[PDB]
A paper describes a structure:
The RBD may be likened to a classic human torso; in this analogy, the shoulders and neck are involved in interactions with the ACE2 receptor. B.1.1.7 is harder to neutralize than parental virus, compromising neutralization by some members of a major class of public antibodies through light-chain contacts with residue 501.
In order to understand this further, we determined the crystal structure of Fab 269 in complex with RBD harboring 501Y at 2.2 Å resolution (STAR Methods). The results indicate a marked (7-fold) increase in binding affinity due to a slower off rate: WT RBD(501N)-ACE2: KD 75.1 nM (Kon 3.88E4 /Ms, Koff 2.92E-3 /s), RBD(501Y)-ACE2: KD 10.7 nM (Kon 6.38E4 /Ms, Koff 6.85E-4/s). This is in-line with enhanced interactions of the tyrosine side chain with the side chains of residues Y41 and K353 of ACE2. The reduced binding and neutralization were particularly marked for some, but not all, members of the public IGHV3-53 class of mAb, since the IGHV3-53-defined CDR1 and CDR2 cause the antibody to orient the light chain in close proximity to Y501.
Numbering used by the authors:
A (entry chain H): 1 to 132, 135 to 219
B (entry chain L): 2 to 215
C (entry chain E): 334 to 516
The structure:
């Protein structure tokens, strides 16, 4: 029953504008303290803006004069107009209801806002080639480098190889492009008997890459 | 007013009594709330007004304190309680404050990492860039340190690293560090190494290669 | 005969801000210089009138409103302010002519374990008009389903206590406020 549903998140270049919406059911937006809270990737929660049932609006200093909160009583929705968007504004944006002095009981699922000047680029997939030196366990992998935007999906041997696979969180490089690595550990003795292929899929660029990873000669 | 949260990271087992502390730089009486958050989910209200249990939250959660010292206590930790936890200053419009957070992970015995170093591929070097990758596989606890060395010169400001979530099967972490240089810079040095320090290692472990040597 | 300012400023107990008191003051000479010179006031801000050059004037009616609020809420007792207190408890007009006087009352209005006598309205559908006083305690309905006087989900008691304690931070401590408006 009671829920808040966000929409309107997406990709936008710096200085552009985006509008978030929070469609409420089971509570009445204009009868409540309604707030927007954001969380950057890996960071904590940051309160953004509130609108009182009485109409008063307040804003965190890092968004003042750029963001505008509002509501539509006929559609029981809460909105957030975001102007002059900056890279640091990249976050997941929650709407929440404040029922006691800031305590948020009902939250939306969040919507993602990405602010970047980067252009859509497909990854370059480079082999992480096993050492050509010891015995026991061998590691090999793929370096999925210089793509935008998120996400990419990596599988090994078309999904037949799942055990021992570690696909790491991507890192945002100072170039504006993401980069990640995906590794798998296997028994040393299998490096000469089993072929290993990582399958990289980046749907925003319509890019699918299969890379054979072999020990270097 | 600022909120600190202690400890930053906490390792616990199923059935333990876990206490998390939030500290306010001034006397805020009972104006505090506690949230739980799991990766990719919205926060979930646990406690408000320092000690009132939010409805539907299990009773093993309780909050206490007043003034500056607040604690969240899970009396018997359950598998779905492994998450992050945040405190919040109430009655602080127009500027609510959230604590930095506490991450509670699954305790297990110490496991040293398997360390592997990967040279840049010949294919990438044709592009004018060299990515050197160092891998730390299946270790515990999460605290680990990768030190890149280039001809024994400690490198800072040219690496990025990333860590997996605690593995569902063996409760370990894995770390990937990438050292990035221009092809020109990369060809000015010979010995490329990453030195790993970790609780499970009696002494630091270094994996290296010499550029140009297979 | 002097004006009963001592009866207002030195009153034994003050009212909660939501149920603020108003003293009608007529037919008396007042010495506002004795008021301003008292260094025992944290806030003494006058709007539309100079503070010192006030003794030699003539107004039909003077109103002395008084209540208790937090330290951090005193800034809301001014024209054109927004917030819990200004929207839902005590509202001054934008064209206000008068003075706002305040002082810390931690040693009178805070008690160990919390003084729960002083309250403020937390919930109200619309803002107060200037000099409006709302003293209702009906359960505030925050959703479609009506409350019928039962607190619960989407059904909130509108008043909350400041719980003033002597060890509070200054921003949470009690301040006594006197608002003098001149008609
Ligand atoms: C509010 O009271 C102060 C102080 O009250 C004094 O002490 C009380 C216990 C009671 O016995 C009062 O009658 C006392 O006056 C008033 O300030 C005093 O003013 C007198 C001059 O009339 C002076 O001799 C005192 O030293 C002052 N004391 C202090 C602490 O300032 C003040 O005038 C009263 N406010 C109003 C509006 O009348």
């Amino acid at each position: 029953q009671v829920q808040l549903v966000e929409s309107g998140g997406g990709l936008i270049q710096p200085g552009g504008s985006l509008r978030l919406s929070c469609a409420a059911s089971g509570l009445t937006v204009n009868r409540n303290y309604m707030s927007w809270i954001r969380q950057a990737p890996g960071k904590g929660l940051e309160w953004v803006s509130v609108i009182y049932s009485g109409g008063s609006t307040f804003y965190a200093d890092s968004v003042k004069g750029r963001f505008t909160i509002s509501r539509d009583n006929s559609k029981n929705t809460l909105s957030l107009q975001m102007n002059s968007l900056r890279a640091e504004d990249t976050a997941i944006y929650y709407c929440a209801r404040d029922f006691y002095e800031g305590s948020f009981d009902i939250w939306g699922q969040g919507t993602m806002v990405t602010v970047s000047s980067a252009s859509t680029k497909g990854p370059s997939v480079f082999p992480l080639a096993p050492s050509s030196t010891s015995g026991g366990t061998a590691a090999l992998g793929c370096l999925v480098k210089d793509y935008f935007p998120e996400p990419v999906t990596v599988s090994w041997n078309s999904g037949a190889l799942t055990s021992g696979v570690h696909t790491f969180p991507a890192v945002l490089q100072s170039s504006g492009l993401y980069s990640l690595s995906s590794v798998v550990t296997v028994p040393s003795s299998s490096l000469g008997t089993q072929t290993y292929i990582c399958n990289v899929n980046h749907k925003p660029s319509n890019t699918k890459v299969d890379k054979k990873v072999e020990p270097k000669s | 007013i600022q909120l600190t949260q202690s400890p930053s990271f906490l390792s616990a087992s199923i059935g333990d009594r876990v206490t998390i502390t939030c500290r306010a730089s001034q006397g805020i009486s009972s104006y505090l709330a506690w949230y739980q958050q799991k990766p990719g989910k919205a926060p979930k209200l646990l406690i408000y007004a320092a000690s009132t249990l939010q409805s539907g939250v299990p009773s093993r959660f309780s909050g206490s304190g007043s003034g500056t010292e607040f604690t969240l206590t899970i009396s018997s930790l359950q598998p779905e309680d492994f998450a992050s936890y945040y405190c919040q200053q109430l009655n602080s419009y127009p500027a609510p404050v959230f604590g930095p957070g506490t991450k509670v992970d699954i305790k297990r015995t110490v496991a040293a990492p398997s360390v592997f170093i990967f040279p840049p591929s010949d294919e990438q070097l044709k592009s004018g860039t060299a990515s050197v990758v160092c891998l730390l596989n299946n270790f515990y606890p999460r605290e680990a340190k990768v030190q890149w060395k280039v001809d024994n010169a400690l490198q800072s400001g040219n690496s990025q690293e990333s860590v997996t979530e605690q593995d569902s099967k063996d409760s370990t972490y894995s770390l990937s560090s990438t050292l990035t240089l221009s092809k020109a810079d990369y060809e000015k040095h010979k010995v490329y190494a990453c030195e790993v320090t970790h609780q499970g290692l009696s002494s630091p472990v270094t994996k290296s290669f010499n550029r140009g040597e297979c | 005969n002097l004006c009963p300012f001592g009866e207002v400023f030195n009153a034994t107990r003050f009212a909660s801000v939501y149920a603020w008191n108003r003293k009608r003051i007529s037919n008396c000479v007042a010495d506002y210089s004795v008021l301003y010179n008292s260094a025992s006031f944290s806030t003494f801000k006058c709007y539309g009138v100079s503070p010192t050059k006030l003794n030699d004037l003539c107004f039909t009616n003077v109103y002395a409103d008084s209540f208790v609020i937090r330290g951090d809420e005193v800034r809301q007792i001014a024209p054109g302010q927004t917030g819990k207190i200004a929207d839902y408890n005590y509202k001054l007009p934008d064209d206000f002519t008068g003075c706002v006087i305040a002082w810390n009352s931690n040693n009178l209005d805070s008690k160990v374990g919390g003084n729960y006598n002083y309250l403020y309205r937390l919930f109200r559908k619309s803002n107060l008009k200037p000099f409006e006083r709302d003293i209702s305690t009906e359960i505030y309905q925050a959703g479609s389903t009506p409350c019928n006087g039962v607190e619960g989900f989407n059904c909130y008691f509108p008043l909350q206590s400041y719980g003033f304690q002597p060890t509070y931070g200054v921003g949470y401590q009690p301040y006594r406020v006197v608002v003098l408006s001149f008609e």
